[PDB]
């Protein structure tokens, strides 16, 4: 069984960048529904798989991608944020960011452009291409997880679903993006990067 992970900090720790109300709703309401529905969907799939029912397996695909992706995406997101984050990364990561994007500022612009640009609900990702051996920016629609649909290893994800910023920033997505850079836990994205730095 999958579980709702605990937040590494209090709901009001990312203030004033992302307010406590969004953090509470996002985690306790949105993420909780994903794991519950994921466990419900996985049990159904186990029933379908055992019967060799291919129709049921295919019909169940959207719910699993949506809920399974929802769980995966949000789980990474909480670890990517920190009340002690912000600033710039250091060491190997910064080294690779300058190499692949030109500069840290250029990387920020690319990821922001990618995030602001998703039409509808989605995610902006900084990922690692294990085949090519470099960093890569990608945008994923709805809850489609990065690794599962793209093959890239997720390092940093930015949720651009409206529930992630509307209460505080309303329709101005760029304001939310400008603000989230102040709480990015570079300590965690450097770890994820090192984990696949092979």
**Chosen from Mn ion, a second copy, none, partner binding at 143 (C-beta under 5 to 8 Å by type):** a second copy
Residue whose entry in the numeric block shows the structure tokens 């994800």: 157
SS3 128: strand
Count other C-beta atoms under 10 Å from residue 137's C-beta.
19
Q: Which residues between 107 and 166 bind Mn ion (CB under 5 A)?
A: 159, 161, 164
- Residue written as tokens 């930015």? 158
Q: Which is nearer to Mn ion, 146 or 164 (CB)?
A: 164
Report the distance separating Cα 124 and Cα 73, nearest Å: 11
**26 annotated to bind ligand:** yes
Provide the edge-to-edge strand list for the sheet that holds 134-141: 134-141, 122-129, 153-159
From Mn ion, a second copy, none, which one binds at residue 194 (CB under 5 to 8 Å depending on kind)?
Answer: none
Using CB under 8 A as the criterion, what x/- string covers residues 145-174 for binding a second copy?
A: x-xxx-x---------xxx--xx--xx---
**Annotation-wise, does 2 bind a ligand?**
no
Backbone φ, ψ for residue 34 (5° rounding): -60, -50
In three-state secondary structure terms, 58 is helix
Cis status, amide bond into 16, omega within 30 of 0: yes
The number of beta carbons lying within 10 Å of the beta carbon of residue 45 is: 16
Of 65-84, binders to a second copy (CB under 8 A) are: 65-66, 68-69, 71-72
159 is in an annotated binding site: yes
Helix axis angle, 91-101 to 104-116, nearest 10°: 70
Q: Is 164 helix (H, G, I), strand (E, B) or coil?
A: helix
Cβ proximity to a second copy: between 22 and 82 the closer is: 22
Q: Which is nearer to a second copy, 85 or 161 (CB)?
A: 161
Question: Per-residue x/- marks for a second copy, 114-143, CB under 8 A?
Answer: -----xxxx---------x--------xxx
Using CB under 8 A as the criterion, which residues of the chain lie in contact with a second copy when the complex forms?
A: 1-2, 25, 29-30, 33, 38, 42, 45-46, 49, 52, 54-59, 61-62, 64-66, 68-69, 71-72, 100, 119-122, 132, 141-145, 147-149, 151, 161-163, 166-167, 170-171
* Residues that bind Mn ion in the complex, under the rule CB under 5 A: 159, 161, 164
């Amino acid at each position: 069984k999958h579980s709702l992970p605990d937040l590494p900090y209090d709901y009001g720790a990312l203030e004033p960048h992302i307010n406590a109300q969004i953090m509470q709703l996002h985690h306790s309401k949105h993420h909780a529904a994903f794991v519950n529905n994921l466990n419900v969907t996985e049990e159904k799939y186990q029933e379908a798989l055992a019967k060799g029912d291919v129709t049921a397996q295919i019909a169940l695909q959207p719910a699993l991608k949506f809920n399974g992706g929802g769980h995966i995406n949000h789980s990474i997101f909480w670890t990517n944020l920190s009340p002690n984050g912000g600033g710039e990364p250091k060491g190997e990561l910064l080294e690779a960011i300058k190499r692949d994007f030109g500069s840290f500022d250029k990387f920020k612009e690319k990821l922001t452009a990618a995030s602001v640009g998703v039409q509808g609900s989605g995610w902006g990702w900084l990922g690692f291409n294990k085949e090519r051996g470099h960093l890569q920016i990608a945008a994923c629609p709805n809850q489609d997880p990065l690794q599962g649909t793209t093959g890239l290893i997720p390092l940093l994800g930015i949720d651009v679903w409206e529930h992630a910023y509307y209460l505080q920033y309303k329709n101005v997505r760029p304001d939310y993006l400008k603000a989230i850079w102040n709480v990015i836990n570079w300590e965690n994205v450097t770890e994820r990067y090192m984990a696949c730095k092979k």
